[PDB]
């Protein structure tokens, strides 16, 4: 029940990543020539570029937005071992200005993500050496200053990370890390770290044993007040997992919360290496893209079972 | 080794090499049916055979001439070493027919391994043949229009050869155990480096310094500027490789095909980690493949069964979502947006779209008559109708009781305290004699209107006007009046025939223990389609007290079953039945169980299960505010749902509707604390000036700040078609950065006509900061 | 699907003088389509000896009526009919 259209946007080079703002009125796209462009939607519904500049010495992988409450902030990770933070200042032509650069990585910075709003202005970066670094800006009015708050070693090449968007008062912060190592040995590829208030340190909580193939993308789904967490894993086949916390005994509060892991959907319609996965706002529709040049939309049904609902092709031609 | 080649200057012509060489032309077939003798290359593409040639048996190496004239000109070297120039085009005006059919024969019989044209000069053909005992392996000859122009590689094996794309006099060749680079200026001038991979030498068109080779399943890359060791080595494949090729329309893209594989492996060398991808063009093994020289990212593959497939190689796709459920993706250098089909059938749409539509239509704010919300729902769903009618009945009872709390406790709590009921041993076919709790339960179920009326006649007539004949008949029979049910069935059969035979069957009620009618009706009762008829006959045929068939029927509305259990079932087992039904409703998350649980912790659990099933928070938030007890509103989950709904409203920029919802929630829930903001303080006393001249501080009686434009001290009196005490034009306004301010109207006008802070020696552009 | 309900109704045969069954079946049988059902119910509900309703039904084949009359009617009544 999904139809496609082509947006009249002109690009000269190959597009690596596209990202939306919170309200869905601003777009950020990174191209193959170390260039970043920002697009705005008019009241009529048309898109117009508003800024463009070159950022790093190496290739640019990912660019993401921050929450509007902190202003207009973009974060970009690059192959040249850097992660840059940009803020828009207008005096009206937009004039984006770099405010800070994080260079603590010893390998290529593979991915960068923003923390959920209710935890302040935090940022996370996973590198190729197996290191996840979490920074925080103590003052929201001075973005030029950042401090390295936490550092975690994964012993495997990190490839993607995702925060837990839950904002309940009973869920500790959670971050999940994937890997794309293709070692012949059968080793786990997805680990989850849960913050501990009693120690103020992140510790490993659960590791997905059933996942052994290289992983390219991992995505939590929006909580929306449910009683459990939904995770999506992109591999040779799209997989969906549900994690339910167990009732913590009041006798003693100890380490990480124990979880029950159940798989609820495993699709192999791409017949290739699935590359990207994403959720809608309500966490009820899953979008997946793989090497077959097709985009597939999955949704639940009356019987609470997962089945495909849409198939499209990269050219925009419907199937 | 069969292979397919494109026309160097024509995009629609290609050639397939086999025992018979076939030249094909490509035509469109989107708007036309399958043409006779045309091979459907793809869904909308057709290939028409142009020519066939069988004059070349045991073909070994194939090349296609470079220059435009003549068209369809190729050179084939055979196993014996004979190299023949052939043509397949319909050329009646050949420029130099002397070269047509021209053949070069080796001095010594040996197999020609490779043959190629010089790009700079189309008249030069370089061929590497088998290793002779004491003769050159590579011969360069002139096609003109006696002897080869050059001969090299004596006592060597020319596995493969290629030209320098820029240098007209530079060649790369693969020897028996080494790779050599030769210059036409001096044959002795040659750079030879020992190597193991000598097959399939080729140069990237965009990077003239990049070369590739492969031995068995291993592939190596070389940089001609520093060609001493391989620059990189690809992962070795199990099956031996068969073909390697650069993409001419895309920079730094290499394609590899191995033996007996239906998948082509692509590598991205444009990093300077090499990105690896795989493409499956068909369901059978691919014999060979070819990049289209000019068409963008187009490649054609061939199967051994003479079936060819042409396809474009898509790039990696990036995804993003929007708060309006529109999916935007990027593929290459274009952006596509995908939305939902605007079909009339709106029952299958996503929950987010339905929530947006309901929000636009004031769903849930009709407090005058609650039941209209199901009409405001937009779609048809029995659960919502049941919930809203239940809420309407409960509100009506609360209003009546106030005119003249326990109602919201739910059916279970109400009937938990029921006492003094005696079961009936026999049925007399002919209300107020029943206990108060059961009367209240019946009122909640909607069978009996408000009051102590002992007749259900108005309900029956309402159903008759509604047209639901079977349900009305079932209710009438449950009220122990067979003749009334028969009359209703006759009336229903009068309009719109099975009702008549059903009614005439109904007159067979008997109390015999071995009644033939009882046996047959019990046996074949379930074969009917209408559930109400089935449960009616189940009640009729059931023995005294044991009414499990009626009670445990899932196709009947819960309200009717609840009422039937209330009026007939004994309390001692009624409590157990209510408990079981409540549990099985809670575990399933069906909303019809709200009548049972009520707005309590059980209701919270049921609502949580419902949200988990469907992800709807709008209905949960609106429902839980309907006069719920203070303890219920204090639960974490309810407030989490409300906050999530408010955030969702903020996402769509439905700001005003969020304000209306906030007003409604604040009115209903006193526990919620409104938003905290800033307040003004006196300069002298330091106290708040919020809530004896108006323009004086309430505490110190000293003057307040003055408007920067009117130079009058600000102030406002403090405590429907009437007068307004405090107009909007007299409120406090200030610039949050320059801390200058005054009256609303004055500063509004001033900043409408100017763009600077009105106070002297202030440079703040106060109104430009916010946008 | 009608045939199942018809069979269920047929089970209610009773010889009681003032049975609700006999009260309603005779009245309602006239609104059916297949004449065979009508003649069956008429025969069941008819008073003993006077089976005129089945005999004088012209929408049914003559052979069946003749056989029915032969099997049950008295000699004089058979001759007259
Ligand atoms: Zn004061
Ligand atoms: Zn100022
Ligand atoms: Zn100011
Ligand atoms: Zn003023």
UniProtKB/Swiss-Prot annotation, chain A:
Entry keyword set: Cell cycle, Cell division, Centromere, Chromosome, Chromosome partition, Isopeptide bond, Kinetochore, Lysosome, Membrane, Mitosis, mRNA transport, Nuclear pore complex, Nucleus, Phosphoprotein, Protein transport, Repeat, Translocation, Transport, Ubl conjugation, WD repeat
Keyword Protein biosynthesis: no
Known regulation of activity: The GATOR2 complex is negatively regulated by the upstream amino acid sensors CASTOR1 and SESN2, which sequester the GATOR2 complex in absence of amino acids. In the presence of abundant amino acids, GATOR2 is released from CASTOR1 and SESN2 and activated.
UniProt cross-references to Pfam families, sorted A to Z: WD40
Gene3D superfamilies given in the database record: YVTN repeat-like/Quinoprotein amine dehydrogenase
A GO CC term assigned to this protein in UniProt: cytosol
SMART domains with a match to the protein in the record: WD40 (SM00320)
InterPro entries (UniProt xref): G-protein_beta_WD-40_rep, Sec13/Seh1_fam, WD40/YVTN_repeat-like_dom_sf, WD40_repeat_dom_sf, WD40_rpt
PROSITE patterns: WD_REPEATS_2, WD_REPEATS_REGION
GO biological process per UniProt: attachment of mitotic spindle microtubules to kinetochore; cell division; cellular response to amino acid starvation; cellular response to nutrient levels; defense response to Gram-positive bacterium; mitotic metaphase chromosome alignment; mRNA transport; negative regulation of TORC1 signaling
UniProt xrefs under SUPFAM superfamilies: WD40 repeat-like
Major subcellular site: nucleus
Domain of life of the source: Eukaryota
Entry keyword ATP-binding: no
GO terms of molecular function: structural molecule activity
Location(s) in or outside the cell: Chromosome, Centromere, Kinetochore; Nucleus, Nuclear pore complex; Lysosome membrane
Positions of post-translational Phosphoserine modification: 172, 183
WD repeats: 10-49, 55-91, 104-145, 153-203, 210-251, 269-308
Cross-link (Glycyl lysine isopeptide (Lys-Gly) (interchain with G-Cter in SUMO2)): 12
Biological function: Component of the Nup107-160 subcomplex of the nuclear pore complex (NPC). The Nup107-160 subcomplex is required for the assembly of a functional NPC. The Nup107-160 subcomplex is also required for normal kinetochore microtubule attachment, mitotic progression and chromosome segregation. This subunit plays a role in recruitment of the Nup107-160 subcomplex to the kinetochore.
Similarity comment: Belongs to the WD repeat SEC13 family.
Protein source organism: Homo sapiens
UniProtKB/Swiss-Prot annotation, chain B:
Organism: Homo sapiens (Human)
Keywords noted in UniProt: Lysosome, Membrane, Metal-binding, Phosphoprotein, Repeat, WD repeat, Zinc, Zinc-finger
Example GO biological process: protein-containing complex localization
Binding of Zn(2+) 2, residues: 710, 743, 746
Cellular compartments annotated: Lysosome membrane
Regulation: The GATOR2 complex is negatively regulated by the upstream amino acid sensors CASTOR1 and SESN2, which sequester the GATOR2 complex in absence of amino acids. In the presence of abundant amino acids, GATOR2 is released from CASTOR1 and SESN2 and activated.
Entry function: As a component of the GATOR2 complex, functions as an activator of the amino acid-sensing branch of the mTORC1 signaling pathway. The GATOR2 complex indirectly activates mTORC1 through the inhibition of the GATOR1 subcomplex. GATOR2 probably acts as an E3 ubiquitin-protein ligase toward GATOR1. In the presence of abundant amino acids, the GATOR2 complex mediates ubiquitination of the NPRL2 core component of the GATOR1 complex, leading to GATOR1 inactivation. In the absence of amino acids, GATOR2 is inhibited, activating the GATOR1 complex.
Binding site for Zn(2+) 4: 738, 740, 757, 762
WD repeat locations: 54-96, 107-145, 153-192, 194-232, 236-272, 356-398
Family: Belongs to the WD repeat mio family.
PANTHER family for this protein: GATOR COMPLEX PROTEIN MIOS, WD40 DOMAIN-CONTAINING PROTEIN MIO FAMILY MEMBER
RING-type zinc finger span: 704-771
Keyword Metal-binding: yes
Subunit structure and binding partners: Component of the GATOR2 subcomplex, composed of MIOS, SEC13, SEH1L, WDR24 and WDR59. The GATOR2 complex interacts with CASTOR1 and CASTOR2; the interaction is negatively regulated by arginine. CASTOR1 and CASTOR2 convey leucine availability via direct interaction with MIOS. The GATOR2 complex interacts with SESN1, SESN2 and SESN3; the interaction is negatively regulated by amino acids.
Coiled coil: none
Annotated GO CC locations: cell junction; cytoplasm; cytosol; GATOR2 complex; lysosomal membrane; nucleoplasm
Binding site for Zn(2+) 3: 735, 738, 766
SMART domains: WD40
The keyword Ligase is assigned to this record: no
From Swiss-Prot, chain C:
Quaternary structure and partners: Component of the GATOR2 subcomplex, composed of MIOS, SEC13, SEH1L, WDR24 and WDR59. The GATOR2 complex interacts with CASTOR1 and CASTOR2; the interaction is negatively regulated by arginine. CASTOR1 and CASTOR2 convey leucine availability via direct interaction with MIOS. The GATOR2 complex interacts with SESN1, SESN2 and SESN3; the interaction is negatively regulated by amino acids.
Functional description taken from the UniProt entry: As a component of the GATOR2 complex, functions as an activator of the amino acid-sensing branch of the mTORC1 signaling pathway. The GATOR2 complex indirectly activates mTORC1 through the inhibition of the GATOR1 subcomplex. GATOR2 probably acts as an E3 ubiquitin-protein ligase toward GATOR1. In the presence of abundant amino acids, the GATOR2 complex mediates ubiquitination of the NPRL2 core component of the GATOR1 complex, leading to GATOR1 inactivation. In the absence of amino acids, GATOR2 is inhibited, activating the GATOR1 complex.
Domain of life: Eukaryota
Family statement: Belongs to the WD repeat mio family.
Compartments where found: Lysosome membrane
Classification lineage: Eukaryota, Metazoa, Chordata, Craniata, Vertebrata
The protein, known as: GATOR2 complex protein MIOS
Organism: Homo sapiens (Human)
Gene name, Swiss-Prot/TrEMBL: MIOS
């Amino acid at each position: 029940m999904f139809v496609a259209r082509s947006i009249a946007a002109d690009h000269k080079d190959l597009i690596h990543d596209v990202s939306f703002d919170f309200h869905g009125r601003r777009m950020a796209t990174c191209s193959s020539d170390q260039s970043v462009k920002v697009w705005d939607k008019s009241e009529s519904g048309d898109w117009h570029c508003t800024a463009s500049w070159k950022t790093h010495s190496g290739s640019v992988w990912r660019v993401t937005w921050a929450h509007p409450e902190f202003g207009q902030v973009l974060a970009s990770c690059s192959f040249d071992r850097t992660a840059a933070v940009w803020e828009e200042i207008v005096g009206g032509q937009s004039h984006w200005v770099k405010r800070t650069t994080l260079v603590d990585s010893r390998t290529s910075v593979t991915d960068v993500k923003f923390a959920p709003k209710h935890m302040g202005l935090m940022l996370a970066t996973c590198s190729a050496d197996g290191i996840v670094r979490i920074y925080e800006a103590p003052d929201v009015m001075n973005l030029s200053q950042w401090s390295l708050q936490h550092e975690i070693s994964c012993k495997l090449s990190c490839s993607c990370i995702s925060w837990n968007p839950s904002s309940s008062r009973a869920h500790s912060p959670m971050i999940a890390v994937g890997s794309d190592d293709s070692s012949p040995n059968a080793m786990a590829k997805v680990q989850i770290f849960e913050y501990n208030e009693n120690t103020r340190k992140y510790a490993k909580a659960e590791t997905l044993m059933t996942v052994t193939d290289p992983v390219h993308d991992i995505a939590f789904a929006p909580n929306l007040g449910r009683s459990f967490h939904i995770l999506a894993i992109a591999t040779k086949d799209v997989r969906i997992f549900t994690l339910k916390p167990v009732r913590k005994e009041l006798t003693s509060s100890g380490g990480p919360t124990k979880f029950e892991i159940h798989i609820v959907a495993q699709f192999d319609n791409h017949n290739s290496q699935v590359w990207r996965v994403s959720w809608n706002i309500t966490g009820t529709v899953l979008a997946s893209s793989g090497d077959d040049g097709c985009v597939r939309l999955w949704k639940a049904n009356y019987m609470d079972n997962w089945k495909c609902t849409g198939i499209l092709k990269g050219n925009g031609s419907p199937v | 080794k069969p292979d397919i080649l494109w026309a160097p200057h024509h995009v629609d012509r290609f050639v397939v090499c086999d025992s018979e060489l076939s030249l094909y032309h490509v035509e469109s077939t989107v708007n036309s049916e399958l043409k006779a003798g045309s091979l459907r290359l793809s869904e909308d593409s057709a290939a028409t055979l142009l020519s066939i040639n069988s004059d070349t048996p045991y073909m070994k190496c194939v090349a296609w001439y470079l220059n435009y004239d003549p068209e369809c000109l190729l050179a084939v070297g055979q196993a014996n070493g004979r190299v023949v120039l052939t043509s397949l085009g319909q050329d009646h005006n050949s420029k130099f027919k002397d070269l047509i059919g021209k053949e070069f024969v080796p001095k010594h019989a040996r197999q020609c391994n490779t043959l190629a044209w010089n790009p700079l000069d189309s008249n030069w053909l370089a061929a590497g043949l088998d290793k002779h005992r004491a003769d050159f392996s590579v011969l360069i000859w002139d096609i003109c229009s006696t002897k080869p122009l050059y001969e090299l590689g004596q006592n060597d094996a020319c596995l493969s050869l290629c030209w320098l794309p820029r240098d007209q006099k530079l060649l790369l060749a693969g020897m028996h155990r080494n790779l050599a680079i030769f210059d036409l200026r001096n044959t002795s001038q040659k750079m030879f480096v020992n190597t193991k991979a000598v097959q399939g030498v080729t140069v990237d068109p965009y990077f003239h310094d990049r070369v590739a080779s492969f031995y068995e399943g291993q592939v190596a890359i070389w940089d001609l500027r520093k060609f001493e060791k391989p620059v990189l080595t690809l992962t070795e494949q199990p099956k031996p490789l068969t073909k390697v090729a650069w993409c001419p329309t895309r920079t730094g893209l290499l394609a590899t095909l191995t033996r007996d594989s239906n998948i082509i492996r692509l590598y991205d060398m444009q990093h300077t980690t090499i990105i690896e991808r795989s493409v499956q063009p068909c369901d059978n093994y691919i014999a060979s493949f070819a990049w289209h020289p000019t068409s963008q990212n187009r490649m054609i593959v061939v199967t051994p069964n003479r079936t060819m497939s042409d396809f474009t190689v898509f790039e990696r796709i990036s995804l993003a979502w929007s708060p309006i459920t529109s999916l935007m993706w990027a593929c290459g250098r274009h952006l596509y947006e995908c939305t939902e089909e605007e079909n009339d059938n709106s029952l299958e749409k996503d929950i987010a779209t339905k929530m947006r539509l309901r929000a636009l239509s004031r769903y849930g704010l009709d407090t005058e008559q609650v039941w209209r919300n199901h009409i405001l729902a937009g779609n048809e769903d029995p659960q919502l109708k049941s919930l809203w009618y239940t809420l309407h009945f409960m509100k009506q009872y609360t209003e009546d009781m106030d005119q003249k709390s326990l109602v919201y406790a739910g059916i279970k709590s109400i009937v938990k305290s029921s006492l003094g009921m005696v079961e009936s041993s026999r049925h007399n076919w002919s209300i107020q004699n029943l206990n108060e709790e059961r009367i209240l339960a019946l009122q909640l179920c909607g069978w009996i209107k408000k009051g102590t009326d002992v007749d259900v006649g108005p309900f029956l007539n309402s159903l008759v006007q509604e047209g639901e004949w079977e349900r009305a008949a079932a209710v009438a029979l449950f009220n122990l009046d067979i003749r009334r049910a028969i009359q209703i069935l006759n009336e229903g059969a009068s309009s719109e025939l099975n009702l008549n035979v059903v009614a005439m069957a109904l007159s067979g009620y008997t109390d015999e223990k071995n009644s033939l009618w009882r046996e047959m009706c019990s046996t074949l009762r379930l074969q009917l389609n209408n559930p109400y008829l089935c449960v009616m006959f189940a009640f009729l045929t059931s023995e005294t007290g044991s009414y499990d068939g009626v009670l445990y029927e899932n196709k009947v509305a819960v309200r009717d079953r609840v009422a039937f259990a209330c009026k007939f079932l004994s309390d001692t087992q009624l409590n157990r039945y209510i408990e079981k039904l409540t549990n099985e409703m809670k575990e399933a998350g069906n909303l019809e169980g709200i009548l049972l649980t009520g707005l309590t912790k059980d209701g919270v659990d049921l609502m949580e299960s419902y949200v988990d099933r469907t992800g709807d928070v709008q209905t949960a938030s609106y429902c839980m505010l309907q006069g719920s007890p203070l303890d219920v509103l204090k639960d974490e989950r309810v407030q989490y749902w409300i906050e999530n709904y408010r955030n969702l409203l903020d996402a769509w920029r439905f700001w005003h509707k969020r304000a209306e919802f906030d007003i409604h929630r604040s009115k209903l829930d006193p526990s919620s604390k409104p938003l905290a903001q800033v307040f003004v303080s006196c300069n002298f006393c330091g106290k708040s000036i919020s809530y004896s001249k108006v323009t004086s501080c309430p505490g110190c009686r000293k003057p307040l700040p003055r408007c920067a434009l009117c130079l009058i001290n600000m102030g406002t009196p403090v405590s429907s078609k009437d007068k307004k005490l405090a107009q909007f034009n007299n409120w406090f306004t200030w610039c949050h950065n320059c801390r200058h301010g005054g009256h609303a109207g004055h500063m509004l006008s001033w900043f409408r006509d100017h763009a600077e802070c009105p106070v002297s020696a202030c440079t703040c552009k106060c109104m430009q900061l916010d946008t």
